[PDB]
Design a binder for this molecule. Sequence first.
Ligand SMILES: CC(=O)N[C@H]1[C@H](O[C@H]2[C@@H](O)[C@H](O)[C@@H](CO)O[C@H]2O)O[C@H](CO)[C@@H](O)[C@@H]1O
Ligand code: NI
Length: 176
Amino acid sequence: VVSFIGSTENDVGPSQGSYSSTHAMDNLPFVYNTGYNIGYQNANVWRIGGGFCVGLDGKVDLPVVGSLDGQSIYGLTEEVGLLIWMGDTNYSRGTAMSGNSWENVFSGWCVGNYLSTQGLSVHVRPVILKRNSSAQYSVQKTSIGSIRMRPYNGSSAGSVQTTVNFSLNPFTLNDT
Ligand SMILES: CC(=O)N[C@H]1[C@H](O[C@H]2[C@@H](O)[C@H](O)[C@@H](CO)O[C@H]2O)O[C@H](CO)[C@@H](O)[C@@H]1O
Ligand code: NI
């Protein structure tokens, strides 16, 4: 079966992270490719065992202000939005998020007759929407959304906690 073993509120990105870019923000919107640097990752959010089957759904609560290659650009301020990925523990397995409804972000797996864990990951990349004369862009603490576990194939959470939340740590972007 399954148990919750992670934290309910989770911060994405390092407190007061500084993200600079040498590319020219020539055409907007401009994506800051900060890789997986602005993220949260935890291999052990639920413990599971004995044929248990679980995937992950994700939801972004930020307003959609556009899209980039079919993925929603979620707005933070008039100047800065975000591309968002949520999914299984590995950052590389992140699912690009669109819209504001619950979306399947990890197809899932079944644990055999052993005990193991289900984890998750969230990462984002800043997007320059509107220019700033200072060439510096600031964002304060902000709620992003949530991820929940999805028991399937008979399995069920029961009264176990299903959902965790994510907050963006404030950061500053330097247009270098
Ligand atoms: C890696 C970890 O600590 N937990 C993973 C989990 O991994 C399992 C199993 O799937 C994997 O085959 C073996 C290594 O060969 O390790 C076990 O512990 O896999 C799930 C789904 O990918 C992750 O959510 C979890 O973080
Ligand atoms: Ni380039």
